[PDB]
Amino acid sequence: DLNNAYDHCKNIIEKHSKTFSKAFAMLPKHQKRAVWAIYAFCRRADDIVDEGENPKEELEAFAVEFDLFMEGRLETEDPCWIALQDAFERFPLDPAPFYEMIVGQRMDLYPKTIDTKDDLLHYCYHVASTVGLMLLPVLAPGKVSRVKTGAIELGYAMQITNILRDIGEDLDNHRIYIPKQMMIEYGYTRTDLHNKKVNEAFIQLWEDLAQDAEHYYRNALATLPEYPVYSRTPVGGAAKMYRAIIQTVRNNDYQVFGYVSDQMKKQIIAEMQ
């Protein structure tokens, strides 16, 4: 039934993102549950692409399930779809960012060809900004249009942050998200990258992106007063638990070729309060 389907999504978010599970555990009941179901959609699609053996076939099957879902023709025992069906019935969730997140995950089926910062922002929009857009009707009922730009920019901030701390892990998987034109601009070579070398050129490039992320975090945090009261600490705390990674990397001399404990998360959420 519905309560058990959502409970399955609660376990998914608690297992895969203590950051978001702690942040949004404070939301009122039905909005909290919707967040769980929306997270589960994003987590399933991302896990298919990043950890599936036949990711393209499995993502096509997931996309077809979402097609059936949107036509009201999905018969399933999947708790994530059962919960999401209620969330869409209960709140004016917009299907567009759900479709666009699948487009983003399609991007990650193939090797990267990120040339410019605009290419990078296009990627971040589809795999991260869309998450913000999916959530907005439940985080800010009736106020979506006012907080929308900040939610897109929070997606940019968080995904740029992920990229900046995942350079080595991504490289090991033959994924490169650093824009080629920025490597040319700063003189950071593919051989430097392959050798996992931190040098002056790397630090200049890394700081360029990190300063853009910091700009986007500031813009997003400035919109917190426009959310309803129960979403302000959840959204601001989630933002600040991601942003914390940047100063840690700096304090680690930019060694990102290999960040926030649960107590540290609790501290960040209380500080935000």
Q: Which two tokens stand for residue 123?
A: 């990627």
Query: Whose Cβ is closer to its own copies: residue 61's or residue 264's?
Result: 61
Q: Work out how close the CB of 41 gets to its own copies at its nearest, in angstroms, rounded to a whole number.
A: 21
* Per-residue binding letters, 27-56, with its own copies (x by CB under 8 A): -------------------------xx-xx
Instruction: Give me Rg for the CA atoms of the chain.
Output: 19
How many residues bind to its own copies according to rule CB under 8 A?
Answer: 27
> What would you measure as the largest C-alpha separation in the chain, in angstroms?
57
Q: Work out how close the CB of 183 gets to its own copies at its nearest, in angstroms, rounded to a whole number.
A: 5
The H or E element containing residue 208 is helix 200-222
* Calpha distance 42→100 (Å, rounded): 11
Residue 50 marked as a ligand binder: yes
| 180 in contact with its own copies (CB under 8 A) | yes
Residue 179 is given by DSSP the state -
Contact predicate 152/132, CB 8 Å: yes
Contacts of 223 (CB under 8 A, 6+ apart): 146, 147, 149, 150, 151
How many residues bind to ligand GST according to rule CB under 6 A?
Answer: 14
Contact predicate 114/177, CB 8 Å: yes
Q: Contact positions toward ligand GST, by CB under 6 A?
A: 127-128, 131-132, 135, 139, 151, 154-155, 158-159, 162, 235, 238
Annotated binding site for Mg(2+): 46, 50, 108, 162, 166
Q: Contact positions toward its own copies, by CB under 8 A?
A: 52-53, 55-56, 108-115, 171, 173-176, 178, 180, 183-184, 187, 189-191, 193-194
Annotated binding site: 46, 50, 108, 162, 166
